[PDB]
Ligand binder design. Structure first.
Ligand SMILES: Nc1ncnc2c1ncn2[C@@H]1O[C@H](COP(=O)(O)OP(=O)(O)OP(=O)(O)O)[C@@H](O)[C@H]1O
Ligand SMILES: Nc1ncnc2c1ncn2[C@@H]1O[C@H](COP(=O)(O)OP(=O)(O)OP(=O)(O)O)[C@@H](O)[C@H]1O
Ligand SMILES: [Mg+2]
Ligand SMILES: [Mg+2]
Ligand SMILES: [Zn+2]
Ligand SMILES: [Zn+2]
Lengths: 345, 353
DNA sequence: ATCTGTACATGTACAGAT
DNA sequence: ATCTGTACATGTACAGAT
DNA sequence: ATCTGTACATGTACAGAT
DNA sequence: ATCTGTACATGTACAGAT
């Protein structure tokens, strides 16, 4: 049943090769233009993030996330109205308070200029979507591929106080891992008609999340060549697919994204830390317990950011009750009728 | 029972404070003197190693190991007659230690030791001297008299950042225990070469160096579980270190009574337990409730090593620490009888002093 | 004036003490 | 159970040097 | 500072074995 | 049906060279 779906969802080696070869060309050239030109983003470094680099991308290698991160010395953060995730912040002179919109606009300008000069790849820059920190590339290998270039500020200080109680991995990955993770930099991305709209940045833990995905067992050998396989990634994939399929069919679900599922499974991996609670033989009960957890998040209207406990991704302000009830009904239907949506194209 | 022995063996915070305060002074001052002037050892860095920094030092904080490690770029190793552990080194502030491209361990050690003695003479704050050089030892050993006796072994080491020598390829067999990512990451760290410093009267006597994995061993001791939470505040305690301590004590007590055991050292027990931790990787095979069977299975393993004359270096599989060349059969049989005796009569030697 | 090797500043795991 | 000293990893301030 | 070379983890693909 | 072993592909950390 679910093994068959996972077979469908598995990327093909051939497609992986073709997609990656084209993407790396475009990205390499963009990264070079950010330094070889005396741009205000000289020193920016590349960090690959999201599902493709975590090995949980499903169906096709058609969406790539990449961070162009810029180290900024001793910045001062001021939290935005107790939200936990959003901050004002203090070469960059002409982006003054460091304005996210002004900095993003210049960043975006550079990329567009450079993209116009690319003559061997069919590639363009997608119209800016308000509410997105990314510059999005649309590549036409014969097949459609999207690349989100995310601008990020990199700070090396202590993580902000709103995260103090986040990353609750102590009983799963442990205290040494947590302490070491919190010694890495933290990232601010320009996520953005009220208030301090254009000067607000959002914390990003994409780097931490990538380490977690690739080091996800309570045992060091989980999913390694001299360890046992678990089904943690496979459940993420199934849940991701369920949401994608539903979203494709129902405009009512526009406010939901894969990060909601990722966040939910992070909490499930914390609640059920033992690798034996994710035995491949138990794929079905595991998938099912994840569904039940997600439904409880929907019912209670509560899905805390894993890194920022006070930030509720399912607050009324972000996603209307109607949407959450709608998604509850549709998930409950699929669950009670053997997931017919998994059988469609 | 063994819990009571472990109570005796536990270091006291007071003693730890007094010992460490004095040790860190002496070491800090020695390290600073190595950076002065055109000393050949400018750039040498401190790495704390061995039982005290692994939290398996027993009885008293009276012996501390420290490495003064020097990065040497552009190094060619030539293995010494297929031994796995021993190397010539080839290629500069080290100019004065070279003989036609070959780095002399004994000349370098001698200068290192000269500088330390000179500096120690200038310390009027604590009662400290340099122990007569012991043949077969790379260390400059400091004898400190806080009112209590404390030894500090300062080991000179060459640090190479290249890939570990081929003799180690099959060593560190941690894949089923700590895993492949840990193994890979550990093998990306530098390797260390220390002076072999025998006066056996063999070819290349003064130019032979020995591999050291003290840094790797320290990481292993402090990250010893198959679960990442082993011995942590939101995990379960294991008894891996406690078994190491008990076995260490058994050997120390025996060694202090019996001159026949001079050839044995604590590294033999450390190596044996590393193999036992590989053989029995699950944290559940080191439950604290099972301290006795765990200690017992370790003893039985060590006894088999003694009987079969085989204890492979954990990093260098072909190097046999129990070879005939190192330890005569009589010594191994002697230690076998004494271990079997203690084991069969309730460990009376644990009740001594 | 600017730069930097050295030492202080901060945070926490480990394990001993209460 | 909670508290506390040491070790150790990383970030950063600055006297003395350039 | 930038670039390449090496090593090996995480994947996929498929035959032959269980 | 599943598992195991080998081949074949990409990503990624870091040393040593330029
Ligand atoms: N709303 C959000 N808040 C915080 N971080 C987010 C948010 N949306 C996405 N991200 C971060 O950006 C990364 C990439 O986003 P993206 O939408 O491409 O999802 P993904 O995890 O790559 O999965 P997929 O692309 O397969 O749907 C996420 O993994 C996450 O770290
Ligand atoms: N024969 C040896 N071969 C290889 N390395 C050795 C040998 N003897 C000692 N070492 C290394 O030197 C370190 C310090 O040596 P030392 O004799 O002080 O042992 P230790 O582990 O500190 O135990 P303790 O001091 O409590 O007996 C060891 O931990 C080990 O890494
Ligand atoms: Mg993505
Ligand atoms: Mg020692
Ligand atoms: Zn796993
Ligand atoms: Zn443990």
């Amino acid at each position: 049943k679910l093994k068959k779906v996972l077979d469908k969802l598995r990327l093909k080696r051939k497609d992986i090769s073709e997609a990656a070869e084209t993407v790396n060309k475009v990205v390499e050239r963009l990264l070079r233009r950010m330094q070889k030109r005396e741009s205000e983003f000289k020193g920016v470094e590349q960090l690959n993030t999201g599902s493709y680099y975590e090995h949980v991308k499903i169906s096709a290698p058609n969406q790539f996330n990449v961070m162009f991160k810029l180290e900024v010395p001793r910045i001062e953060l001021q939290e935005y109205y107790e939200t936990g995730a959003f901050y004002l912040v203090k070469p960059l002179s002409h982006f003054l308070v460091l304005s996210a919109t002004k900095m993003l606009s210049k960043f975006r300008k550079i990329i567009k200029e450079e993209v116009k000069e690319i003559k061997d790849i069919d590639v363009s820059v997608e119209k800016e979507k308000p509410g997105s920190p990314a510059v999005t590339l649309l590549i036409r290998n014969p097949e459609e591929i999207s690349v989100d270039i995310i601008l990020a500020l990199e700070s090396k200080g202590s993580w902000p106080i709103s995260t103090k109680e986040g990353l609750p991995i102590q009983g799963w990955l442990g205290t040494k891992v947590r302490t070491n993770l919190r010694r890495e930099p933290f990232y601010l991305v320009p996520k953005n008609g009220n208030s301090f709209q254009g000067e607000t940045w959002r914390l990003s833990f994409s780097h931490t999340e990538k380490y977690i995905l690739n080091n996800h067992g309570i045992e060091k050998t989980c999913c390694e060549s001299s360890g046992a396989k678990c089904c943690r990634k496979e459940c993420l994939k199934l849940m991701k697919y369920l949401l994608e399929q539903l979203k494709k069919e129902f405009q009512e679900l526009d406010a939901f994204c894969s990060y909601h599922v990722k966040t939910a499974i992070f909490h499930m991996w914390t609640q059920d830390p033992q690798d034996s609670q994710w035995d491949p033989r138990n794929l079905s009960s595991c998938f099912d317990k994840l569904l039940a957890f997600f439904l409880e998040c929907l019912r209670t209207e509560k899905l805390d950011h894993y890194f920022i406990p006070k930030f509720n991704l399912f607050s009324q302000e972000l996603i209307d009750r109607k949407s959450k009830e709608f998604l509850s009904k549709k998930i409950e239907y699929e669950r009670n009728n053997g997931f017919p949506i998994f059988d469609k194209l």
